[PDB]
Design a protein around this ligand. Structure first.
Ligand code: NI
Ligand code: NI
Lengths: 620, 620
């Protein structure tokens, strides 16, 4: 029924048929990306027009195509040919992962490099990594993958423990040619293993941990209807899933008594980049756009009950397409549950004798993905008081290198001879704002200190100032933790009872943004990451901060281009793009396996309600 | 037993007996402060010497006294008479609170002010607030409290909803005289009530929340021995309680294999100030040092099971002295339990076929206090991975005023006619560091951006830089969220297996520090709040960032005086003083009762261990 429901297996199959039939699907055609399209903001619209967008790659070498299918009608709406050298390459196919190792295994240059290091080629794993865009003119138009080797001493051995520094290969995965093999020098291959399940390393396991049981004897307080529509403690929303973004949230609204008030139209992590700060040519090109180039949604783990999600869990098993258009289900790929969150409000009043205490709760919508060495958990939380929060959790095994003799200013030692190059994990949350509807605007609020003098004789006064961002060319903002800078999104035509425009305030963590030199390739390709907040006029084709085809795209692809339009954002349909991330200088405690590190942001009601929206929560 | 055990009722009664016996506790005497002292450094003393320090007030007006007694030896170690005009008044006595409203009820100036606003004196509550130090010369040497009125329409009414602006009185609470009554003009007294338990206001209560049962079938995993010694998942510590500071953590150590490795010798919230930013003469003097002036510990609530502390809880009921030296127990005033904390580490390795997931947990030690309209929760957390964290939770009722007719730059509106002056809640965590022992050092670590060019041809490199703070003169530091500034505390003589000094990194939230003009009284009295981090050389008499006597005390004592000694802190017994707080511009959502707002900091191991300390964590 709902046009926001999750894609069905049936719908994926139908897309396959429709493609085949029109000749768009054949023998050397691989589906690099396939995902349902969101409704077009119309009124009654065309009853229900479920459209899917597909990126189709051609194994032979023929030009790829961007095609939009209509499943309800069974038609092909568009089918454009893509000039990848112009618009960038398509998302890396899962099936191209092995290819880089296989091709290198017969390359005499590779083999020579391995032989000089006394490495058995059958033990050398090669990580198929994105290439980005650097000084290699012969790569433009070609679908390249770079490779870095890791020695795996046996089937269950952790290869990350054994990086082979001083060597890197570039591979054309279409023409199947090893375009280049670079050996800058031999580096000792770290010998210590990092097998965290090897009782020789772990030591005897702890016997001290006693059970903690989180149970809901009467079940959860939230309802799931129409497959992915959630209703919980006045909150209302639809849980979507896209192969590229992962869990996406639609129509986040709050039922303020009678009115179901919209807050956020669509919330998603539209991009996730991991830039490395090691100036060694072996790794200086390394920058993974986990969302844009690899598609974090396809690599979502099947979360196990009790281990990954504890308590009363309600799962969603999204369905994606495989390389040939067949539907694949990610069983238990999404966790939905409500968890206790301490004290919500408390006051023991002397004068009244009333002692009041209420407990908080947060609805949780999460998924965990695995991209090579890292694993990331994406968590969305809705709180009783109207707060919306996102939190990313980074784990996995660190990406290793050799630790230079003489130390390093760009790499840290994890174990003898083992290094961990400096890097960052930068996210972009795309928030299609709908504060009490689509007529919104954003203001930058700074704390204002005042000078002692007339009107402030005791020099105790302090205020706040708000600047409305009116045109897109003024909506590219940076953080200022010092002055407590935040950004408020309000509806200038919807006022609370005190006659103030209803709003929501965005609280960032103010972590550092992209450190790379402004003139670097990564600065140009991931320009969104050089600023904390961007505001754009909504447009159905501006979906990602880095553009639609990130793989090997030259630069300035998304936000910088969109922002160039300089559209009116003062009281219009707008989108807030918040850049936030972690800057990592790995520590010895991050090895052999990294404990979770976290980052995020949140939005709190700012005059949205007429008084506290949690006065009706019972004692219990 | 352990010299860190909590003070028992017997010891307090004995301190009383010893004071009495010595002629220090006659009938006109009142205990303004009583607390056990920590054992001396090194411990060159044979056996235990439980010493208590006391601040003795004299109701007849005689000079007060600071006394240290040895309850073990039944002796008085020292007893000095205090010149309060010079060194500061003693903490406000709980009994002086009621004095303000009652003396004013018969003052004709007060009565004339109330009559002018048509208020029945029998319904006018007076909030007895600390006075601070301003231009009132007649106050120097006297114990003054200022009063602000709030109307209470009936016994169970919330007076905070009805502030009486334009009026303030000053009262000498010893001589029992109303020194001054200031009426700047009448302001409408807000009429709307703020009774959060009134069904008319709350509306019908939600029937939607289903139960969340958190149980521990086999009991908790921590052990409590000697009354306050906790051992949990390799952590070891003693939970102390001081009437001024509240919960204080002693001897925080981690069992790294065979060795019990010290991390933090003593951790406490040594001070907290709540400055107001309304330049109205009615409130411009308003600044509460809840810890130093009121003593947050004495006002600790008795926590209710399931309401305040859900799960398997182990309670501590600390004992304090009453104004007469008799022991008084705070029943269930401290909550101790462990809580699940999501995913600790996770990795699904392609190359190995090994899928690994471990869950996190944290030991929680907390207490909640109520000082007038505000209620604060103080939480300490210990994580499986070695992370230490503190979190303050601010709730209660907003301090109100009238909302000016033509708006306000320093006050916000909560209801019709109801205002909420701007303010901050700033804390000072005093961390007596012992990273693998007392020989510590602090380095300020900034992320370092590099220019593209020779050695960084692709402009992708980024580094880190560490500056050692060698003398106290250079140990007063500010935050820099932009360059990822943190501070590392290391033991320059204890190295990990990679031959690097073991350490812990302090991650601050980088919230705005004290906003008041530097030349303000509050800037001088709360100098510690104007900077994020201070490092001092340990001294047994440097306990609080503001000095032993904050009440009506000007600048001259505290951190700025300690620092001037300019001692060596490079590899010595040192103490870290971290300032962190909330800046509040109240919102309508904060009325009638405030939802919890939080702030804090944490310390993560930084090359302290030789590898991840959680490899032995089982399935879970
Ligand atoms: Ni990392
Ligand atoms: Ni506040």
């Amino acid at each position: 029924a709902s046009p926001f429901r999750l894609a069905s297996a049936g719908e994926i199959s139908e897309v396959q048929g429709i493609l085949r039939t029109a000749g768009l699907l054949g023998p050397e055609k691989r589906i690099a990306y396939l995902g349902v399209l969101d409704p077009a903001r119309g009124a009654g619209s065309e009853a229900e027009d479920r459209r899917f967008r597909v990126f189709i790659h051609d194994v032979s070498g023929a030009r790829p195509q961007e095609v939009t299918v209509s499943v309800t009608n069974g038609t092909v709406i568009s089918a454009v040919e893509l000039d990848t050298a112009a618009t960038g390459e398509l998302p890396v196919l899962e099936e191209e992962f092995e290819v880089v190792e296989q091709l290198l295994a017969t390359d005499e240059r590779w083999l020579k490099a391995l032989a000089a290091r006394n490495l058995d080629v059958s033990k050398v794993r090669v990580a198929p990594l994105s290439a980005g865009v650097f000084e290699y003119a012969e790569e433009r138009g070609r679908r390249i993958l770079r490779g870095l080797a890791f020695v795996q001493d046996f089937p269950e051995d952790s290869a990350w423990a054994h990086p082979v520094d001083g060597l890197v290969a570039y591979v054309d995965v279409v023409s199947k040619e090893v375009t280049r093999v670079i050996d800058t020098g031999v580096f000792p291959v770290p010998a210590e293993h990092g097998n965290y399940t090897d009782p020789e390393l772990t030591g005897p396991l702890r016997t001290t941990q006693k059970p903690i049981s989180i149970t809901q004897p009467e079940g959860p307080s939230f309802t799931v209807t129409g497959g992915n529509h959630i209703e919980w403690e006045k909150w209302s929303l639809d849980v979507g899933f896209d192969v590229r973004e992962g869990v996406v949230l639609h129509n986040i609204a709050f039922r303020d008594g009678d009115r179901l008030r919209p807050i956020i139209n669509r919330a998603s992590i539209a991009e996730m980049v991991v830039p490395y700060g090691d100036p060694s040519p072996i790794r200086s090109w390394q920058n993974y756009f986990d969302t844009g180039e690899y598609l974090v949604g396809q690599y979502a783990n099947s979360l196990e009950l009790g281990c990954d999600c504890l308590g009363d869990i309600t799962y969603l098993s999204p369905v994606i397409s495989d390389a040939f258009g067949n539907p694949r289900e990610i069983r238990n790929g999404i966790c939905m549950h409500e968890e206790d969150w301490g004290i919500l409000a408390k006051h023991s009043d002397l004068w009244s004798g009333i002692n009041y205490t209420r407990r908080n709760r947060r609805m949780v919508i999460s998924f965990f993905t695995t991209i090579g060495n890292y694993d990331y958990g994406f968590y969305w939380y809705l709180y009783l008081d109207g707060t919306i929060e996102f939190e990313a959790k980074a784990t996995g095994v660190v990406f290793t290198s050799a630790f230079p003799e003489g130390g390093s200013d760009n790499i840290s030692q994890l174990a003898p001879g083992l290094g961990a190059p400096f890097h960052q994990h930068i996210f972009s949350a795309r928030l299609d704002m709908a504060i009490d509807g689509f007529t919104n605007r954003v203001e930058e609020e700074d704390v204002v200190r005042q000078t002692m003098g007339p009107g402030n004789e005791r020099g105790n006064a302090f205020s706040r100032k708000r600047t409305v961002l009116t045109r897109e060319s003024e909506a590219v903002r940076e953080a200022d933790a010092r002055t407590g800078r935040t950004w408020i999104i309000s509806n200038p035509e919807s006022k609370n009872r005190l006659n103030e425009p209803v709003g929501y305030k965005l609280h960032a963590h103010n972590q550092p943004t992209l450190l790379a030199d402004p003139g670097s390739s990564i600065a140009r390709r991931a320009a969104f990451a050089t600023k904390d907040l961007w505001v754009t006029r909504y447009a159905d084709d501006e979906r990602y901060p880095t553009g639609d085809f990130v793989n090997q795209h030259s630069g300035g692809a998304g936000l910088p281009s969109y922002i160039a339009q300089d559209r009116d954002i003062d009281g219009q349909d707008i989108v807030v793009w918040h850049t936030f991330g972690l800057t990592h200088f790995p520590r010895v405690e991050d090895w052999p396996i990294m404990p979770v590190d976290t980052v995020g942001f949140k939005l709190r009601p700012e005059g949205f309600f007429d008084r506290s929206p949690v006065l009706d929560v019972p004692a219990n």
